[PDB]
Amino acid sequence: PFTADKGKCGLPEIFDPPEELERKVWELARLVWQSSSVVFHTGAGISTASGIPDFRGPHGVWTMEERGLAPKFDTTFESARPTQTHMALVQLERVGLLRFLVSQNVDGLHVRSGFPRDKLAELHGNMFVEECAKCKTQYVRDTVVGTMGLKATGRLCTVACRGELRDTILDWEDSLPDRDLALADEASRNADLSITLGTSLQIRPSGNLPLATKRRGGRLVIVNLQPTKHDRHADLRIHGYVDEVMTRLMKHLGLEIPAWDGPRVLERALPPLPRPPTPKLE
Ligand SMILES: Nc1ncnc2c1ncn2[C@@H]1O[C@H](COP(=O)(O)OP(=O)(O)OC[C@H]2O[C@H](O)[C@H](O)[C@@H]2O)[C@@H](O)[C@H]1O
Ligand SMILES: c1cncc(-c2nc3ccccc3n3cccc23)c1
Ligand SMILES: [Zn+2]
């Protein structure tokens, strides 16, 4: 816990140059077009552009701790806005181009963006969510739940129960939530394309799920500023700011990045919207 292995922290960033970056984002569009079933895997890197520091980046939480410095937040969790990347993922699910979203972030932003919780696995918890120890009912709150480590928050269940509400933030010893891990693993195994965004992939099992997509000849794209644990397994690695990669990708796909209405919770995915017709790929 004080000696929990924090992994490789502070590795140098890589920047694909402008013409290489454009070529690679064209190739990602091409893979999205060809794929039947696309799964996204997100980590802390997708939220850095909203003021939330990552873990293992040059100014990440664990990196700065290793140097005796403090991470810096430019927002609260409550005042954080979803990024361009978050909103792109919203739109991709609505047009049917994303099948499932697996995230390691506890920041609450995928939920707050309006992304449907039945297409989302939150592998490490959500700081806005508490759960009834008795009936298992989850409550998505407007403020951060004040505890971590699956502790009693002090509130009680209101289902038509009085069970003790607990946080969903996993500590180092806690195993992953069974439902989320099982759904994420099924999606990952059946996917023909997994795309990783702002994750160094160092944590197991979360970081290993994209590799499951490889198993029946699926493709793996990694989008990240630093090296990741599974770079040698990638069919494509794009080294660039995720918001720049995702905006360009959406432009290639013919999709707008939709407006954020403010914090909204969608339980169940809506029926799919029209999408552009697909290019001929020779
Ligand atoms: N704007 C950006 N664009 C592209 N890449 C980015 C950006 N910002 C940061 N990065 C990269 O984004 C990556 C973020 O990697 P890590 O910090 O390891 O976060 P995780 O989500 O994989 O951490 C997994 C768990 O480990 C923890 O203990 C928690 O429990 C986490 O849930 C870095 O490589 C950055 O280069
Ligand atoms: C996402 C990105 N960077 C840092 C966190 C984080 N900040 C936390 C801040 C204070 C209290 C507990 C926290 N905490 C407990 C699990 C994770 C966190 C989340
Ligand atoms: Zn209950």
Query: How many whole angstroms from 139 Cα to the centroid of ligand 2?
Result: 19
Pocket of ligand 1 contains residue 47 by CB under 6 Å: no
Pocket test for ligand 1, best of 3, 180, 225, 245 (most atoms within 8 A of CB): 225
Query: CA-CA distances (angstroms) from residue 171 to 148, 151, 196, 205?
Result: 7, 10, 23, 15
Closest by CA to 64, choosing from 55, 52, 73, is: 55
Residue 224 annotated as part of some ligand binding site: yes
Task: Please state which CATH class domain 125-173 belongs to.
Answer: mainly beta
Task: Answer for the pair 211, 230: CB distance below 8 angstroms, yes or no.
Answer: yes
| Cβ burial 25-36 (10 Å sphere, 16+ → b, else e) | beebbebbeebe
Partner residues linked to 219 by β-bridges: 193
Q: What's the one-letter identity of residue 225?
A: L
Q: Which of 41, 86, 124, 239 is catalytic?
A: 124
Q: What's the one-letter identity of residue 133?
A: A
Closest by CA to 39, choosing from 109, 124, 123, 97, is: 97
Task: Answer for the pair 80, 109: CB distance below 8 angstroms, yes or no.
Answer: yes
Other beta carbons within 10 angstroms of residue 237's beta carbon come to 20
Six token digits for residue 246:
């995702």
Task: Answer for the pair 213, 221: CB distance below 8 angstroms, yes or no.
Answer: no
Six token digits for residue 143:
């403020």
User: SS3 of 117, please?
Assistant: helix
Closest by CA to 274, choosing from 94, 112, 118, is: 94
Other beta carbons within 10 angstroms of residue 189's beta carbon come to 16
Q: Rounded to an integer, what distance in angstroms lies between the CA atom of residue 280 and that of residue 43?
A: 33
Query: CA-CA distances (angstroms) from residue 122 to 39, 102, 125, 217?
Result: 14, 6, 5, 26
Please indicate the experimental technique that yielded this structure: X-ray
CA dihedral 132, 133, 135, 138 (to 10 degrees): 30
Query: How many whole angstroms from 164 Cα to the centroid of ligand 1?
Result: 33
Q: Rounded to an integer, what distance in angstroms lies between the CA atom of residue 154 and that of residue 75?
A: 26
Domain 17-124+174-269 = CATH 1.10.3720.10: no
Resolution value, angstrom units? 2.0
Residue 56 annotated as part of some ligand binding site: yes
What ranges in 17-76 are assigned the alpha helix state H?
18-34, 61-66
CA atoms within 13 A on the CB side of 272: 11
Pocket test for ligand 1, best of 11, 14, 16, 55 (most atoms within 8 A of CB): 55
- What is the helix (H) or strand (E) element at residue 170, kind and residue range? none
Report DSSP state, residue 10.
Answer: S
Strand stretches in the chain, DSSP E? 38-42, 100-103, 120-122, 129-132, 138-140, 152-156, 164-167, 193-197, 219-223, 236-238
Q: Rounded to an integer, what distance in angstroms lies between the CA atom of residue 172 and that of residue 175?
A: 8
Q: Rounded to an integer, what distance in angstroms lies between the CA atom of residue 49 and that of residue 62?
A: 18
Q: Rounded to an integer, what distance in angstroms lies between the CA atom of residue 113 and that of residue 176?
A: 23
Q: Rounded to an integer, what distance in angstroms lies between the CA atom of residue 209 and that of residue 70?
A: 31
What is the domain partition of the chain in residue ranges?
A: 17-124+174-269, 125-173
Q: Rounded to an integer, what distance in angstroms lies between the CA atom of residue 168 and that of residue 210?
A: 23
Report DSSP state, residue 79.
Answer: T
